Symmetry: C11
Subunit: 64 residues, 11 copies
C-alpha cells in the first residue's frame, strides 16, 4: 500500500507504470504533482524527465 510523490521540474515529465511491455504512461507538466500508489497491476514505476521525488526512503531527483 505504499506511494511516491513526484513533482515535475520541467514540462513533459513521464511517469511510466510497468508490469512486459511498458503499460501506463502519464505526462506531467512543470510544477504538477503526482501521488502514485503501487497497485497489483503495477510492479515498477519509471520517471523520465527532471523531477523531485519523495519516497518512504527519502528524496531523490530525476535528471532524465
Amino acid at each position: 500500500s505504499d506511494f511516491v510523490v513526484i513533482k515535475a521540474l520541467e514540462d513533459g515529465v513521464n511517469v511510466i507504470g510497468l508490469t512486459t511491455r511498458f503499460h501506463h504512461s502519464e505526462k506531467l507538466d512543470k510544477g504538477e504533482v503526482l501521488i502514485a500508489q503501487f497497485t497489483e497491476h503495477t510492479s515498477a514505476i519509471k520517471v523520465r524527465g527532471k523531477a523531485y521525488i519523495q519516497t518512504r526512503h527519502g528524496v531523490i531527483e530525476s535528471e532524465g
Copy 2:
C-alpha cells in the same frame, strides 16, 4: 488506507483521480483530505497547492 492533505493556494486547483475517472476543483484556501481507494491508483494535482503526505510536505506550482 493512506491519505493526502491538499490546500489550494489559488482558485481552480484541480485534484485528479486516476483509474480517466475523477476531477475535483478546489478554490483558494479550501482543503481536501483525499484517501486512496481501490478505484484510485494515482492522484494528480494541477495548480498552486500545499500538499502533506506521510512523506512530508510539498508544494505544487501552477504555470
Copy 3:
C-alpha cells in the same frame, strides 16, 4: 481507519464527504464546534469549506475558504 479533527473558526463551515462519485454528505459546523471525521468505505475524500483548524496524522493545517 484514520480520522481528521476539524475545529470551526467561523460559523457555517462546511465539511463535505465525497463518494466512491461527486459532492455528497455535507455537514455544517458553527464557530468553535469540533468534528472528528473518520474515513468510511463510502467516503473517499473530505473537503473543508470555511475558516477551520484541521489536525491529521500529517500535522496541522488551516482552511481559509469561502
Copy 4:
C-alpha cells in the same frame, strides 16, 4: 479501533454520533469524561459545547 477522550468544561455538552441524521446524542455535564470509540455505525463525532478533547492527533478545545 481508535478513540477520543472528551472532558466537559461546562454542563450540557453534546457528543453527537453520526452515521446520515442525528443518530446518537449523548449529554455530558461539567467535569464528566467520555471515552468514545469509533464503531462501524459511527462515521463522525460532533462536539457541541465547551470541552477539552484528546485524540491521537493531540489536544484541542471545543468552544461553546
Copy 5:
C-alpha cells in the same frame, strides 16, 4: 483492542459502558483497567478519577 486505566479519587465513582448501559461502581483508591469490547462503543466516567489512556492522562472532576 485498546484500554483505559481509571483510578477512583473518591468513593462511588461510576464507570458507565455504552440506550446502552453497563454501570460499574468504584471506591476511593480502586483501579479499573477497562478494555473496549464490540458491545461497548463508549465509556463515561462520573466522579473524581485519574484516567490514563493511550492519549495521556486526564482527571475527571465530579
Copy 6:
C-alpha cells in the same frame, strides 16, 4: 493481546476479572501478569498494589 503487571503490596489483594466473574487473591510481594481475554472485558484491583500497563505505572490504594 495486551497485559497488566500487578505486584501486591499487602496480603489479600483482589484481582477481579469482569464480564465478579473471576476473582484472584494475591499475597504481599506476589506478582500477577494478567492478559485480557475475550471472556474478560475489565479488570478491577482492590487492595494496595503496584500496577504496570502500556500506559505507565499506577498504584492502587
Copy 7:
C-alpha cells in the same frame, strides 16, 4: 498476539503459575530463567517467590 515474560529465580522453589482453575505450576530454582509466553490456554501468570521479572512494561521484582 504473542507476548512473553522473562523470569529469573532469586531463590530456590520459585513458583510460576499459569492460570485459566489453577492450570499449570512450574518450579524454578535459584538462578534458573524461564521465558514464558502467553497461550490461549493461559490468561494469567502468577509468580510466588523471590524473582526478577522482565516484561514489555519494564522490570519488576517479586518478593517472596
Copy 8:
C-alpha cells in the same frame, strides 16, 4: 506469533528446556542457540550458566 531468544552457554551442559501446553536441548560452553517460540512451545526454561538476550533486554542465568 514469532519471537525468539538468543542463548549463549557460559559453561558446558547448559539445558534449554521447551515446555508444552499444560523438549530438552544441551548446550556446551560458547555455543549459541537462537530459539523461537512455536505453538507446541509455551515456555522455555534455562538451567545452567548462560547469557540470554530477549526483546526485553539481557539477562544472565546462574546455574
Copy 9:
C-alpha cells in the same frame, strides 16, 4: 510489499528481475526506477553505475 529506488548514474544501467533471469530493464543516466518485489520476482540485480535506496539505507552500484 517492499521497494527499491534506483537512480542511474550512467547510460545503459541494467535492472534485472530474477525468477533463471526473467525480466531486464534498461535505465539511462538520470532516470529513476522505483521497483517493487512481486511474487514473480525473488531477486533484483543492478549492473552499471547507480545510486540505490532501500529500507536498509543507501548504496552505490559501481559500473
Copy 10:
C-alpha cells in the same frame, strides 16, 4: 518472518536447524549466512567461532 546473520570466524562452523530433526549447514571462515526461521525450523544452534547479528543485537559464538 525473522532472520539471523551469521559470519563464520573459523572454518567448519556448523549452523544447525532444529524442529527431533536436524538440517546442518557448514560455513567456512569469512562466509556469511542469512538464516530465516521457517515453520519447519523452531531453533538454530551455532557451533564454532562466529559473529551473529539478530534483532536483539550482536553476539559471538566461541568455538
Copy 11:
C-alpha cells in the same frame, strides 16, 4: 517479506539460496537485492561482499 542487499567487492561472488540449490554469480560492483521466498530458507554468501540487512551491515570475506 524481508530482503538483503549484497554488493560484490570482487568478481565471482556467489549468492546461494538454500532449502546447495539456487546459485547466483555476482561480479565486482554489481548489486543484488535478494528477498526471502517460501522456497528459500537460507542465503549463503561466498566471496568478498558488502551486505546490508535489517540488522545492520556486515562484510563477507570469502573464496
